[PDB]
Design a protein around this nucleic acid. Structure first.
Ligand code: ATP
Ligand code: MG
Ligand code: MG
Length: 438
DNA sequence: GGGAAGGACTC
DNA sequence: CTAGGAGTCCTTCCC
């Protein structure tokens, strides 16, 4: 909940529930929770069959591993995570001044991509459907998303970022990591005028410290675009991101570059505030008595024998406050996809032609990157939100509508057939091309 | 070690 | 169109 707290979680939760109670969605949502409780159940079973000598041995490895990490802990880099405030809303408020005074969201009546802060006061958030949102805030204006407009402001701000780190990596249209470690060195020798900017006396000079260079960035960002950003400063990416939210909107937070600072932050940081730990992992760990990053580190024993090698390796990093100190600046796309949810469709005649408009639309997007690919996956979703997913890869490549529809046509047919005589009651369909030459 | 199927997570 | 769409990475399962 990254914005408004101190909310009437009673009148809000009641409304959300009344508008979800007997829904077809909530039904599936309930079966999911059952499925997640089962998963916990097998974990809790696996736990019950561990012997203290088994556990004790785990302690040896994990502590040795820890010790290795701890020795290669890097506190030399200053990483900044920039995170625009209520981004899609804000852009729209900028574009259309009228809206600047009221609660608004960007999305549809059936789903919100975000919502400006005034609306968050009513508990209106992203991922929440616009019709529930409107019940929370009957005067909410929902604005349709216009990605071209958002991409502009994105590259409008990416222009400020390159100054402080030509190598900065963007994560989305409103987020990027910067490693200002090198800028911070050169900046120590910068005279006033090189760090003095004219407002909207009318001028300010920014200091020489990381804290200031980030104030300066945020300032330039607000002045050039009209929008406000928040920022996190810390030794590595994982912390920098947690920090960029500690003071939203329009503020910033630093963890100073020393072990203890890190350690003091982490201590009581709820594990869910970390990027990559979701709703499920939270619940699974809460089940083992794990809520804060301290509790996560103290169970490093158990974790290495209940979870995939990659999950505990990862969990351990977080528990010790480690993260990336080096922005990969990688890239290259793994897949491209087009999918669409719609008022029910059970007629195979249209199911086939929807798959065509999709395959066809995909081809064009795929075309603009001049990309070609071997694998093709369709994705159908019942009227009950159950999702199927059927793949097929050929051995040539395939690129245009007709050829990509060629394969998707068939995959669709097999599932219509598989359920015959009963037709497939669909709310969603989608088509994903992947495995590109490389 | 190249598939296919289902999911967790995040924006 | 009255619970999105887009993408990546993982976990498991078979030649
Ligand atoms: N669940 C979502 N579905 C579709 N688009 C989203 C979703 N969440 C975010 N976005 C889009 O990406 C942008 C960045 O998301 P982010 O999580 O940074 O929230 P925000 O809108 O910037 O608000 P703030 O960062 O102040 O909390 C949003 O403005 C929009
Ligand atoms: Mg943001
Ligand atoms: Mg999280």
């Amino acid at each position: 909940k990254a914005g408004m707290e101190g909310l009437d979680k009673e009148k809000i939760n009641k409304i959300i529930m009344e508008a979800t109670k007997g829904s077809r969605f909530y039904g599936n949502e309930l079966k999911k929770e059952k499925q997640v409780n089962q998963r916990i159940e097998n974990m809790m079973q696996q736990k019950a069959q561990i012997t203290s000598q088994q556990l004790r041995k785990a302690q040896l490895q994990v502590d040795r591993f820890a010790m290795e990490l701890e020795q290669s802990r890097n506190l030399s880099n200053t990483i900044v995570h920039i995170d625009m405030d209520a981004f899609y809303a804000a852009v729209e408020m900028r574009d259309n001044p009228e809206l600047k005074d009221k609660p608004i969201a960007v999305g549809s009546m059936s789903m919100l991509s975000t919502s400006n802060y005034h609306a968050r006061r009513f508990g209106v958030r992203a991922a929440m459907p616009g019709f529930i949102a409107k019940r929370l805030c009957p005067q909410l204006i929902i604005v349709p998303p216009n990605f071209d407009k958002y991409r502009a402001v994105s590259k409008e701000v990416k222009e400020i970022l390159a100054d402080y780190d030509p190598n900065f990596m963007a994560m989305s249209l409103d987020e990027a990591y910067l490693n200002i470690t090198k800028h911070l060195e050169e900046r120590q020798n910068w005279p006033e005028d090189k760090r003095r900017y004219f407002i909207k006396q009318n001028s300010v000079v920014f200091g020489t410290s990381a804290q200031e260079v980030v104030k300066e960035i945020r300032f330039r960002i607000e002045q050039k675009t009209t929008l406000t950003a928040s920022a996190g400063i810390a030794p590595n990416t994982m912390l920098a991101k947690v920090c960029s939210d500690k003071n939203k909107p329009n503020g910033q937070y630093q963890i100073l570059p020393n072990r203890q600072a890190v350690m003091d932050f982490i201590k009581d940081l709820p594990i869910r505030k970390v990027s990559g730990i979701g709703k499920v992992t939270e619940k699974m760990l809460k089940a083992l008595g794990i809520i804060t990053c301290t509790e996560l580190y103290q169970q490093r024993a158990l974790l290495s024998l209940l979870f995939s090698e990659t999950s505990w390796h990862y969990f351990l990093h977080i528990s010790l406050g480690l993260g990336s100190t080096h922005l990969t600046r990688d890239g290259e796309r793994k897949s491209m996809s087009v999918e669409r949810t719609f008022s029910e469709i059970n007629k195979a005649e249209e199911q086939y032609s929807l798959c065509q408009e999709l395959c066809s639309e995909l081809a064009q997007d795929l075309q603009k990157e001049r990309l070609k690919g071997r694998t093709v996956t369709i994705k159908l979703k019942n009227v009950n939100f159950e999702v199927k997913t059927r793949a097929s890869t050929v051995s040539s490549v395939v690129s245009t509508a007709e050829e990509i529809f060629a394969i998707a046509k068939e995959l669709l047919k097999t599932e219509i057939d598989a359920d015959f005589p009963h037709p497939l009651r669909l709310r969603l369909m989608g088509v994903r091309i992947s495995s590109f030459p490389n």
